[PDB]
Amino acid sequence: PSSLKIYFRLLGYVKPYIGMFLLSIVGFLIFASTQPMLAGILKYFVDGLSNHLVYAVPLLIILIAAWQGLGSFLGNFFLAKVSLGLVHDLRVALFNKLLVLPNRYFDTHSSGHLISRITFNVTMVTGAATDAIKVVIREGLTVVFLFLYLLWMNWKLTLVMLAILPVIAVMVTTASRKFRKQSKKIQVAMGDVTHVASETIQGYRVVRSFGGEAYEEKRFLDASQSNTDKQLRMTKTGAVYTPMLQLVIYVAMAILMFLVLWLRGDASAGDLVAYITAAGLLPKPIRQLSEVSSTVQRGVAGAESIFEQLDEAAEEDQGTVEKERVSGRLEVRNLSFRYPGTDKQVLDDISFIAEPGQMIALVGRSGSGKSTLANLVPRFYQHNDGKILLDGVEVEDYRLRNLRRHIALVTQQVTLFNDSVANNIAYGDLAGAPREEIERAAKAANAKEFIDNLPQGFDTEVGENGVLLSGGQRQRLAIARALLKDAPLLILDEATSALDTESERHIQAALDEVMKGRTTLVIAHRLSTIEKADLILVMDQGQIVERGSHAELLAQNGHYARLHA
Amino acid sequence: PSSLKIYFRLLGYVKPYIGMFLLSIVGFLIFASTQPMLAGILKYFVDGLSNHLVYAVPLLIILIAAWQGLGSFLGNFFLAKVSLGLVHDLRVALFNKLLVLPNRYFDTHSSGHLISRITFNVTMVTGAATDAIKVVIREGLTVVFLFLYLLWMNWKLTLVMLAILPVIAVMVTTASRKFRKQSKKIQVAMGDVTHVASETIQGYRVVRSFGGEAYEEKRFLDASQSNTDKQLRMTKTGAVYTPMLQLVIYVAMAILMFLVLWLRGDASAGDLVAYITAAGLLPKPIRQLSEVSSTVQRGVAGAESIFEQLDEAAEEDQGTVEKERVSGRLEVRNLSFRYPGTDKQVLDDISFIAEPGQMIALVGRSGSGKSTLANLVPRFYQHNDGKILLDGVEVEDYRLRNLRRHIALVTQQVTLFNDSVANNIAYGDLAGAPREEIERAAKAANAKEFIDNLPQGFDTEVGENGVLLSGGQRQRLAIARALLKDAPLLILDEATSALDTESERHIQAALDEVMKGRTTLVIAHRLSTIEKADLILVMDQGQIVERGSHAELLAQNGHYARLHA
């Protein structure tokens, strides 16, 4: 959008700190007004020395010095509260937006891009909102006052200095366009540097195993070189732009001098001398304005990237139905789905009904769409064709927070936080549960045995993503996390992929006790864990080719019979 | 260590940019010397107006303006070059260290801390290395010259101004200590904020499924509030620190004034007046020095944080043996291992020999230590008790780069990069392989069928960590990546956990053709894929309880018989 629209929207975040901003200006006025007083009283003491009591002058120095210090403290301290408060408000707004963005947003964006926006882009708007305003108001008023002051003595001579106003306006406009474009390139380049570093840290084991240290070094060297080159190009533009405006001023002054010499007749000192002296006070304010033009555009480009994320569309939440507890009946009716931005159809026509106290088993080859179907019930991705009804109400009529409270999920990709074992099991809505409840859930997931052997028991830290645990132990913590949540609907997405047969039997036996009070949807590749399911759905290329029980599907010679053995 | 040592070590990175620093100083000297010339020529032109040709003054104005612009451009551009070069060198040094740090370093540190160190801590050293030096040199020389001038005029009066030096020194020392501590706290807080943001971004699905948006919001709010409070505390400390030094200076000046009045006898103007005038030039340099101490200490803290990582111990690389190709014989002899910082024993006594063209199967319950045993061959973790020999040479005698070239690894946790399928399959040492080789490798891993159906074929982007693919497809891509590398030794760590029976059969059939020319170590929980292994090792609680073939282990009634059915 327009650069003025972005800047005015940025100033809306400085409104709560208007009172603190005025104190900073008042404090700096006290500091500035002291300098003439100290110098003036210094001269009086000196003059008295050469020549009705001056013995009070030494005492007055301390008072004015203390008065100067109070003004300096107010200016510096209360200006930081405006700058730090503005940055803090933007960071909180950016992070709270991350918790409502759709899943498809995180799939098409790197983590380094998002981290850099909250860390680096926010600091780029500090100067444009605090220091830039003071300079523009102060030096801007000085230039306007001087031009009115010059017009008073001689309007004919001011026409020469007015003729260079258009050329400065064109030059300032052209330079501002470059600064905004160059700042946008710099923030993207900084995001690329963070993206390379984040990717290498996440996959250091792949880099360490298959070689590629030379490949990773070159990739980061190019990313860092571009960031340095683009930052250096901005400085070169700024370092030529400021001196070039000064040369325009002095060229105009040179033309003014020639006219005065030719116009020296019919006049004398006191009128032409005053005009030349006044005209010489213009270069200094213009230099200050030039050096702040880069800062303003740097903030404008930074705020544009910040406001792009804040204006991004969140997941649809137009529902209003809230229920304390649902029966758990799940029904899918003629559902078809394709991922956004993709023309491939993942699900063609799905129809099944799950009654309370039942298991529905989802089996098939890899890539059939079993995880996609289970990811539409919690409304991770929006569906357009078909209906998904939970307890007779379409899942789009529930509120998002209320809908996800009734569904317990065990994803295929197990993710854990860098915290204690007890904190990982009781996370979010179930946080603060009694330790007895946590241990009961862990016992059901066959996880109490290895937890008790940890150095600190349930308080042991698992490290980053649970790296300090084996693959099967991480997965059993994810199962325990979902069992504590209870919920009428439980979806298991390959919950025993990293477990042996003995651990599977213990978990499968413990899952029969939660059979009666909930509806379970199981996606499994080991068919021995779903042999007691009420309904088994065999899905191939997005269509449920076969359905029935274990005996019915075995008698029929189809995909299930071949997959079973 | 000492702050002086850290600061001197930091200046070692500014040595390559000494010439640019001198050019910047020369340019700024050219800029500074112009102002008196312009003022004097303006005064000369004004005086001639009131009253042997002055018509060249306008041209001299333009010439001097151009000279001033050239000086300003040189100074600004080359100072920016020095700062950007220093930052780039520090970032490149930091990133290259990440590629040699041990696995245990990444296991005990968050990615957010490492990302923040390369991004935020590096920018904290610019001022202390570029702007601090000029101010310190200039104002220190000014203060020393002023003190010598005062001592020349009257040494008796200078004793009063000498008596305030110790209090200033003590005050500056205390302020510097506080500044260093506060800078360390601030950078730690920024690392915490980055860690919270990265953790929330990485595990957004868990946050979205189990609730906890309020929990994450509160955690990030606390982190940001702590960071803001610490920065505000530093600002308050500095803003109280400077005016207090000014007040000390002015108290000393008041005492001097009181002494002068009593000493007015036996003297007159020209000696006492000069002393008072000279003594009044001291507050400004001391004020300039005070405002730069905070920058120096902030840079010192940042440099200390950087040098802590740069001095971290890398993985041991004392070996020297290099081989172009090894036979592939693997032998483990009386190996025992415990993870660093942990008193629990993972492996007790392991002994097995793998001949070329053989399969060794590792089976057992979860947490037995199979991945730990498989992770010692590539020397991911250092072992102390026992010997691991590859082709009759202990694995610690090989160079790390040469040793890992002979081993192809399929880790349990599949990790992919945000790039094309072909780039993921051919990564690192095998980069640049012909497309025919990549397609042949993908065909063996039963991955060509689903790759050919992608929108762009082999050039399709898989997204962050391959999120745009199902788990089985990612695992098959990892298998293809490992198969392309060839290598005499191949280790598979649950390579078929996320695959159905048909894909498992296809991959197992394709793996029999690579049987003859390599030695294969397989860690499997699905025992149907290792029924044709030459040797099967059943490991329980870190000990190989049973060994033999499928028929031998089935005839014996032990752990394998129970695990099989």
Ligand SMILES: CCCCCCCCCCCCO[C@@H]1O[C@H](CO)[C@@H](O[C@H]2O[C@H](CO)[C@@H](O)[C@H](O)[C@H]2O)[C@H](O)[C@H]1O
């Ligand atoms: C609504 C906002 C705009 C409306 C009002 C704008 C008018 C601004 C009036 C400010 C006039 C005083 O100008 C002010 O002078 C002091 C020094 O003299 C400067 O202060 C500067 O030098 C001092 C010297 O110690 C430093 O402590 C300080 O860190 C530095 O910023 C301020 O940067 C400047 O802003």
Ligand SMILES: CCCCCCCCCCCCO[C@@H]1O[C@H](CO)[C@@H](O[C@H]2O[C@H](CO)[C@@H](O)[C@H](O)[C@H]2O)[C@H](O)[C@H]1O
């Ligand atoms: C080995 C290093 C130390 C040995 C040499 C140290 C002596 C330093 C001599 C420098 C004397 C000139 O001092 C220099 O003046 C100019 C302005 O007058 C300042 O420059 C400052 O104001 C100008 C005004 O346009 C701005 O363009 C510039 O961005 C800003 O930094 C420099 O910050 C200062 O360093």
Ligand SMILES: [Zn+2]
């Ligand atoms: Zn992005």
Ligand SMILES: [Zn+2]
């Ligand atoms: Zn799946």
Ligand SMILES: [Zn+2]
């Ligand atoms: Zn850390």
Ligand SMILES: [Zn+2]
């Ligand atoms: Zn394992």
